[PDB]
């Protein structure tokens, strides 16, 4: 209902001339901010060079290879292969398809089960929507397809506000060992988790969770799938949310920040463990499946990544602005309407609550965040509402002046929300 | 293989200065031909104003809504509603999702099965690869997801060369009625077929098939899902392969030629029937989470469609160069190595056969076509080989002057292979 | 119908290349979507502007800055009006008021040229040398005299061009010493006469005329309606001939034909007098143009300099076009192949070896105009002159198209006449 | 000075959030009121199709022909013929040009004089400014181009406050017969007047006046030209101020409210009389007599006219809100600082005076009106001050609820001035 005339930097100007700070990077994706001519230029060039090449006819300096090199260099040091695709949901299909195929080639075809988390988002294909724990998506059809289970999420504030933050961290990761010993270790092929859940609020694991979950992936013989669709490309202060939590994923769906949202593209990083098996000594994969991603989108994604490592914008993001934003978000932790002030790197969330000292949640808390979102825009700041959780995922080029806009506009938006409610 | 440097029109010049008539529009997709600056311009202009935006906010003359009017005009027989996605494989996911969700809303949740065909291509996601009858993609152990069946394909030349084509046509279309009587009408949600199986050898149904399969879909209460990804946008002489065969799809995935291959986008056309139920009186938008279509990709695709109706290139393809190409492809049917000369509109195929009067196929017939494909690239003509099938999907910009070029490289390419 | 690029598709499904930019105006070509949006946006905000209440970021201010930036040189003031004909009225009106304020109300005469077009209002038609327009009543109004045009082909085909240029530019001093310098307020000329058949001055004319306008005390009015916005390779035909006008009508390419607008660049000399130290705007005062049209026109200039479409026009395709036009000078029907920048003409003649002209050459050219459209090329006819003013986005592949369609059109006409 | 931001209906909101009812129409022109998105829609759609009518050509269904059809049904009776131009000032040039040409074609080139009126506005070109009577414009030089004379205006209040209205009406229109009898009937080609002088104060002729002018224009062989630029399109209660005063103009300039001020355009309506002669038995006004206007401005203008006849806003304006507005305006005539309250249709004026029963006019009365204007905006009402005359030209969308707003802010605005 807003209608946007101009979009440049971290801003959205609206039809009536109102400047709106985009705290959401649109949809977690535009990391270098808007209005980058350098991406529109490389698109124009590649749409004229060759817009769709097959395997019998490659062009000269094809973008699939320019991109492949940059990503093997920017990604963790064990992941040095990539396969492309048309969005970030496609990525979770290929992972499902190939994680199972890895075990078949290792002689254990019974290993085909894939464990997820409740309130986890992994795509919207028929496989992304089954792996995703959003129980609302599962209504449409008998969606959770065979071989997909789901386990507890580490939402300390919403499940168990009183448990020791770190004892809960250990408990909710052992929820994985529980589901392993009920299904059968030899039936489980892998575990997939966002380093942080975007779509469910900014649900951040206690610092204990990921360590225990890595332990379990060793005692039991299973692959790790980290979904860097959102936490990828500077979103957690680091190139990939894996290196924030010292994970060694055996697969990673990527998208969004790959092209800063300027072009549909997704891919999957493939660790060297699983590459020796499915690529060498394996060609039934890539049968019909063809992973020479759309050349125009890989061309943009290449320039997108050059822009971020050469102008050091994600290195500056994690070193200079991420602290200030996180330190100052906590400041909103004292507003009477706010229960938790959550956040890591360049992403953050607020919990909206009826009273704090007894900490009672609202009956219908979505109606409360749904209002606060409508008043953040009406005060010049985009901020999503999952439930009564307010979230921001700003572009990575944000400047400290633009966080003090964000904080002061948030405080105003909370004060207005707090007056209406009582 | 060859390193294409430049590409304009229907030609690809490679590192060595060789002109190569692209008979495969790249991968059945570049319909307005290569080298159309007007599309690269509109992409440049849209990536500058708004490269992407949340659905809460919108653009002023949003690119996706303009596209939607065009698709509701070029062919809206009764299809005046479209949902978009990131590729054409994503598209068949949204159909399976929503075909099941439509019957749920009419009180029949047990109607959830979708019948496909053997050797049909319907995507490469985990649902496209299940719907598709390619037995190689199924190699997985349990790829065909629950609730997907497959039936006989109407490949007259390869299934049953002697049967009368129209009785073989009715035979393969009743394979649909047979599968319904085993599965149970109340379990079947819909049946889906390409109008012509592209990815599987240009396998053209006898003229008897589609008439029957529409009959079965009416007597039985099952939705018809026509896959215009590969046949859509002039490829079949008409705007869409449906109006050529008088179909009334209740869903049509489209892609590849929506944007003439310049930009990842696909969608599903939605007939006014199924639209009444799922859109009004229902909240699933779109597959199950909102996707209004990437503005940059919708911007290209829209201008691409204008270029095609406003310069009338799908009209000229279907009126002047298709008849000519179809007339002349047949001319190759007499060559000693050609059993069938198949073709409709701007798509066509040849079968390679060891002997014709005894009608022998090769043992290992794939080895022969891969050699003939290798000899068209070597003679300046791209030509795909599915099996012992040679196929062409030239762009819609071909000129009558250029079909005579394509025929000659074909006749030239065949003489050599018969000589090996 | 579906006009896109340099092409106009017809009601009958036919592709026609517009070598006329419609009417000397669509410079960024047709089918430019970004201009329709800024119109949509501006019509939504407000439809009027006056001093007692105006909108925010009114386009008149944006356009005024753009027209006083890498567009003119010593002209840093502009006034807007509803067309390019209104523009020559404002100039006529204010040239006289400039002298009134210097104590010289006797200075009110304005010398023009024969076959110069300067508008179609009652004063544009007086300033214009077209004698068909003068019939309507006693049109040539008081003031306004006319002198010889520098049309070397039709006036004096054999004289040395360089001096024929000096002679026709002294026609200005001759008319001054006949009327009286202290009665003359100014001289007005297109840098090139478009509507009169792309009449290109010998390189000598414009040099002399600058001489005369110093020795004699008179203002210079250069009519950049057609030659403005790249038509001559340069932003304005002034900087092609190193002229320094004290007034310039601008229109047409101001908005590439997308929205009615015109203006006047006003040199700093004459602004010190009429603007500072003067009124003039006493309910005339419609110095504010229509906001929607200024908004369209502003985007038009950004697009033209930001994509450098007139810098490329003069540097890359104009030479190709001009050079390739000359090739038609060999055709049996062609005496001269004239042309500068992005504009050019052909003269149709009965024969070349004695240079014989036609009995009724318009009836011959009116025929060729009718056959260029029929072979897919718009080409206007002044008399027996064929003229083209293609949009500035033309591509060399489309000039090779323009030349081939012309040669065919000339060959066909050469068969008919014979 | 007063920055406006959003504008809707009969309202303007400024930078401080103040609602200001526009009692003018900006410049007498916005008739369908502000904020009509449907006008921006048709302009965006036309600028894409054909932004510049080439030559003797057409797009598909050119906008100039539809405008002419609408304008020949809206201005029917004699008329049925129209030209186009870029402003309304350009229009009076085309009239002067062709009125002289009409007589030239009748063998009478000496009939070339055009009689106008003092303090009348007819344009800002050198001919509009010659015809226009206000000497502020003529002082620039010898503006009155040869062949233009001017006569007395029918301003009962300012010329002759005591003469009986009807007798002063006959007295002033015979100023036309006097001037014919001095110049020579055979030199006078036509006489032209606004039905009501807008730009010069809302000077409304006595009811006796226009009857005499029609008398004079018959006995003597001279054409009548009525300037419906300001009074046209509902401004005078009826579609055109002509039919209110039952005039039969042989030419009418139109412009404001042709497009509600959203797009530069004007035209001249041409009676059948002058049409037979300048079209047939002549027509050497080139192919372009003028015509076409501008495809875009014609499209905007066509839509503006549909909105006014399909929603009947000009029929309702004179039938429902106008009677009311004129009746309540009289009320302000009783205020001690107000002498005369004039008004017709959707236009009305007030005279500012020192005392009423001695009838003293102010010395420097514009300074009183300039002050009252600045105080009407200061109290949320636009109201022009031509001299010491206050005038209002509210849009035609005004509501009876909205007239009570205008009277109250007026009475309030008048009280402030009365002690100052």
Numbering used by the authors:
A (entry chain A): 34 to 455
B (entry chain D), D (entry chain C): 34 to 453
C (entry chain B): 38 to 455
Question: Which lines from the publication concern this structure?
Answer:
Herein we present the development of a PluriZyme, TR2E2, with efficient native transaminase (k cat: 69.49±1.77 min−1) and artificial esterase (k cat: 3908–0.41 min−1) activities integrated into a single scaffold, and evaluate its utility in a cascade reaction. The reaction proceeds through the conversion of the β‐keto ester into the β‐keto acid at the hydrolytic site and subsequently into the β‐amino acid (e.e. >99 %) at the transaminase site. In addition, we report the crystal structures of the TR2 enzyme and the newly designed TR2E2 PluriZyme. It presents the typical type I fold of class III ω‐TA observed in known structures present in the PDB database, and it contains the characteristic pyridoxal‐5′‐phosphate (PLP)‐binding domain composed of β‐sheets and the catalytic base Lys289.
